[PDB]
Design a protein around this nucleic acid. Sequence first.
DNA 1: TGAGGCGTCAAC
DNA 2: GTTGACGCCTCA
Length: 59
Amino acid sequence: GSRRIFTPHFKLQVLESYRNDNDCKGNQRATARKYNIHRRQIQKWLQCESNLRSSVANN
DNA sequence: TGAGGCGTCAAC
DNA sequence: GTTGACGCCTCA
């Protein structure tokens, strides 16, 4: 239904939290819940997180 | 019973 | 055309 405006920094913020936040680190549902987003997007961004990095032009 | 992975469609 | 949103199957 929706397509909100997701920034790579946010995506990477999700992914970064997802990867280090003691609250979601290692879990996709928890990060999506904490960030109030879908858990398919974390998984999908992962399918291109490397691309997210070059997209934000940092790290 | 609860968590992780992939595909297709409409809006961006 | 690609990305945000949604479901079914399998493992411990």
